[PDB]
Amino acid sequence: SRPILEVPESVTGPWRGDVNLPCTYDPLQGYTQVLVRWLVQRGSDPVTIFLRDSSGDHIQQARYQGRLHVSHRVPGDVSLQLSTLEMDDRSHYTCEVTWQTPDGNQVVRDRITELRVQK
């Protein structure tokens, strides 16, 4: 049918350690991945923390540049890796993927996960 994102409802990571927030899908013929975004919930509009598009990976905030990476090697795996976890990294995160079909249409799917940080 259409691509199905798989994102666990919650993940727990170690304080000062590293965690992977899984976000994966099985690739489907005729669906080309054109955008990945990861967002975090803070105030009154989701914060964009990562984008991958035709020009590469974009991590605009100094607080994340150097401690945020997104999986790339296996098609369909766009999991977020966050290193040196802070207690205020506890939040809800959105994984959002956009695909383009041969007719030129684009379809967007997203899922939210909760990261808990454990001492």
From Swiss-Prot:
Residues 3-113 form the Ig-like domain. The lineage of its organism: Eukaryota, Metazoa, Chordata, Craniata, Vertebrata. Phagocytic receptor, strong negative regulator of T-cell proliferation and IL2 production. Potent inhibitor of the alternative complement pathway convertases. The chain holds residues 20 to 137 of 399 of the full protein. Abundantly expressed in several fetal tissues. In adult tissues, highest expression in lung and placenta. Expressed in resting macrophages. It is found in: Membrane. This is V-set and immunoglobulin domain-containing protein 4. Disulfide bonds join 23-95.
